[PDB]
Amino acid sequence: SQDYCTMLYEWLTQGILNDPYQEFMTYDDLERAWDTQYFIRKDVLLRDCDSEEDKNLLFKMLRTGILLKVVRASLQIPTIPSNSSDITIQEINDFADLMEGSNLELYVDKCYSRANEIFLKLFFQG
Amino acid sequence: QFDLIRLNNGTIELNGILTPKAEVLTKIEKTLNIDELESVHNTFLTNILSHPYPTSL
């Protein structure tokens, strides 16, 4: 799980998804090019999402990464620094620990919040 | 910095400006290179050459 959670980490904290082996819960179109379509890979999801809580989590996770992707695109930066919104998101060290308990929910909320605060700062003031 | 492209179907769609003015919020010369300068020259020729007949005159 180390690589999977690494892939996830970057998606959630940087909006960076690099999935040459198609493992990830999501992917997009466009491999001008702004009409990005998004896809949910139901078959590789961590949670089946037949429950409201998991559906809500899934979408928050997608938004997190999407908001970050937009910021990177607007700023034309490869990465969003730790010196941006003052939220530190630790790496996933243990996948199972993240799956255990509502750790995804809090982890993602932190991630989401960072994506959201950064996004909002730029959109409102920039 | 609002350069739009007019399409023949009447739609005018922004392009080359696909950025929020590239504002960075938290804080350098827009010069032209050789081909860009050459392009400006050819652009001129196009602007007049591509401008009822010329023979009405």
Side-chain angles (χ1 to χ4, degrees):
Chain A
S1 67
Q2 290 297 312
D3 295 305
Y4 183 80
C5 67
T6 298
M7 188 182 294
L8 179 59
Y9 176 81
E10 294 300 323
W11 172 247
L12 294 174
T13 63
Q14 295 295 317
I16 299 171
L17 172 62
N18 185 9
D19 188 21
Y21 298 106
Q22 302 79 54
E23 299 286 297
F24 206 68
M25 70 183 186
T26 189
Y27 68 96
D28 56 2
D29 206 339
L30 308 174
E31 298 300 311
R32 180 190 63 79
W34 301 106
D35 189 12
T36 302
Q37 312 301 305
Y38 296 93
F39 302 90
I40 299 168
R41 295 199 180 94
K42 185 175 179 179
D43 198 33
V44 299
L45 300 177
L46 294 174
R47 297 280 178 82
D48 289 344
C49 303
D50 58 341
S51 66
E52 297 304 312
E53 295 81 1
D54 288 341
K55 287 185 287 193
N56 291 337
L57 179 59
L58 183 150
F59 282 102
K60 188 181 293 190
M61 292 172 77
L62 293 174
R63 289 194 303 276
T64 300
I66 293 166
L67 291 169
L68 292 167
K69 182 172 182 173
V70 171
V71 170
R72 288 189 288 104
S74 292
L75 296 175
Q76 294 286 291
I77 57 176
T79 63
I80 300 168
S82 66
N83 292 320
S84 178
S85 175
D86 190 14
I87 299 168
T88 298
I89 303 169
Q90 295 77 13
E91 71 279 358
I92 300 166
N93 296 111
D94 183 328
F95 169 77
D97 286 347
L98 183 60
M99 292 306 292
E100 178 180 343
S102 54
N103 289 334
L104 287 168
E105 291 75 6
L106 293 174
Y107 185 80
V108 173
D109 285 348
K110 187 184 294 191
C111 294
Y112 182 78
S113 179
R114 181 173 180 265
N116 181 60
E117 288 186 346
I118 294 170
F119 180 92
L120 290 167
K121 179 179 176 179
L122 182 60
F123 278 59
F124 273 95
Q125 297 177 336
Chain B
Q1 59 189 308
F2 307 107
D3 298 320
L4 313 181
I5 299 172
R6 179 176 180 275
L7 306 175
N8 58 310
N9 65 15
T11 296
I12 301 171
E13 183 177 1
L14 67 168
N15 204 335
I17 58 169
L18 303 178
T19 184
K21 300 183 182 177
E23 181 57 72
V24 300
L25 174 59
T26 299
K27 282 82 68 179
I28 62 170
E29 297 82 15
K30 295 179 178 179
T31 59
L32 302 181
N33 67 36
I34 295 301
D35 288 338
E36 289 170 334
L37 291 168
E38 195 273 338
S39 181
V40 171
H41 167 74
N42 287 330
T43 298
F44 176 78
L45 289 170
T46 299
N47 287 347
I48 65 170
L49 294 172
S50 295
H51 190 282
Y53 306 106
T55 63
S56 182
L57 174 65

